Amino acid sequence: ETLNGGITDMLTELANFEKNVSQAIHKYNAYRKAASVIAKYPHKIKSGAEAKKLPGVGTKIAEKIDEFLATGKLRKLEKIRQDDTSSSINFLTRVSGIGPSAARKFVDEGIKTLEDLRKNEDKLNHHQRIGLKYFGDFEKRIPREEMLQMQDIVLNEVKKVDSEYIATVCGSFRRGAESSGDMDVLLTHPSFTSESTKQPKLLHQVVEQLQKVHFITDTLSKGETKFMGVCQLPSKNDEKEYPHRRIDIRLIPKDQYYCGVLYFTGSDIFNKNMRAHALEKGFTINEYTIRPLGVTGVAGEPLPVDSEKDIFDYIQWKYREPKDRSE
DNA sequence: CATTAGA
DNA sequence: TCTAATG
Ligand SMILES: [Mn+2]
Ligand SMILES: [Mn+2]
Ligand code: NA
Ligand code: NA
Numbered sequence A: 001e002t003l004n005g006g007i008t009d010m011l012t013e014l015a016n017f018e019k020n021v022s023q024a025i026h027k028y029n030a031y032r033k034a035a036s037v038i039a040k041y042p043h044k045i046k047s048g049a050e051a052k053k054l055p056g057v058g059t060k061i062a063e064k065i066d067e068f069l070a071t072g073k074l075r076k077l078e079k080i081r082q083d084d085t086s087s088s089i090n091f092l093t094r095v096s097g098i099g100p101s102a103a104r105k106f107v108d109e110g111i112k113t114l115e116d117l118r119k120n121e122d123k124l125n126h127h128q129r130i131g132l133k134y135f136g137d138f139e140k141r142i143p144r145e146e147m148l149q150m151q152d153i154v155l156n157e158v159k160k161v162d163s164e165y166i167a168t169v170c171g172s173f174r175r176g177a178e179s180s181g182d183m184d185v186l187l188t189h190p191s192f193t194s195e196s197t198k199q200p201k202l203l204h205q206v207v208e209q210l211q212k213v214h215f216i217t218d219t220l221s222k223g224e225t226k227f228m229g230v231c232q233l234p235s236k237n238d239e240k241e242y243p244h245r246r247i248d249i250r251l252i253p254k255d256q257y258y259c260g261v262l263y264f265t266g267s268d269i270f271n272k273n274m275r276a277h278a279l280e281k282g283f284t285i286n287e288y289t290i291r292p293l294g295v296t297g298v299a300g301e302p303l304p305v306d307s308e309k310d311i312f313d314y315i316q317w318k319y320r321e322p323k324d325r326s327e
Numbered sequence B: 001c002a003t004t005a006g007a
Numbered sequence C: 001t002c003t004a005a006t007g
Helices: A005-021 A025-040 A048-052 A059-070 A075-082 A084-092 A100-108 A114-119 A126-133 A135-139 A144-161 A201-212 A254-264 A268-280 A308-314
Strands: A166-170 A183-188 A216-222 A226-231 A245-252 A283-286 A289-292
Touching (some): A005 A084, A025 A059, A075 A084, A126 A216, A144 A183, A201 A226, A245 A254, A254 A283, A254 A308
Parallel strands (some): A183 A245
């Protein structure tokens, strides 16, 4: 966690650099297990050889570790961090919609900077066009102050459409979080559940509404169940407009909410931990359900959940408020 | 790990 | 259809 600090951390740099600059999935796969292992190891690693003992710990890596211990630096890491070709990749990539793959191509064609990206807006697709569009706004955190405002509205429209709708802004914000990055709205409805062959309009109605009143300004993607767009709070009686925000709304089979809901509310850790527990408690939990466990090894049988509670009671735990889903 | 875009 | 990018 700290004792193994630099090592894992250098390890990740190297790893990341493989998968992104190079298309070396393997090596990239190397750096990570390794980096995973030393990360677990209980003692201060003293040298190559020592590390070397570990699984995943090969000679290649060991070699690196040493140079790293001896000089608080690494050449390969020094060269990389330098290489504009690699610097560019790491950068283009920020653009929501620019993966490594594309990050490479762009460069090759000679599109290193954000300005390059604009001069060639043509070579860019809609996602990436909007991505580039709001590049600034995209990178900024969302004040909770605003979160409340946004939320306010979503709920209201949603309700204005049909009354049967159910909404929840999950994630960090849900967890009291001072700020957030994007807003996550879980959605469901009665008419919609497990079997009942969808009703695509379900998603569709709301999207239309939010555009209607001008909350949602664009569409990143709109599918039959997952919408991914951008929004913006009504730039009041001006002098101060609002930044354009990433927002995601997802339809849910009502007989699935709370699980998903529970889930998306996190935290990353609270999840596993909760997850691990339900296990001993004779169960299984995943993005949409909780199933009692059978001794044969595995079992099924999707238990009936009406709110975050049931899932609790189920694994027999303490109701933990979003606030404390911290871990 | 599953959903959408694209080509 | 596969392959990419976001989650
Ligand atoms: Mn989020
Ligand atoms: Mn999100
Ligand atoms: Na080994
Ligand atoms: Na990106």
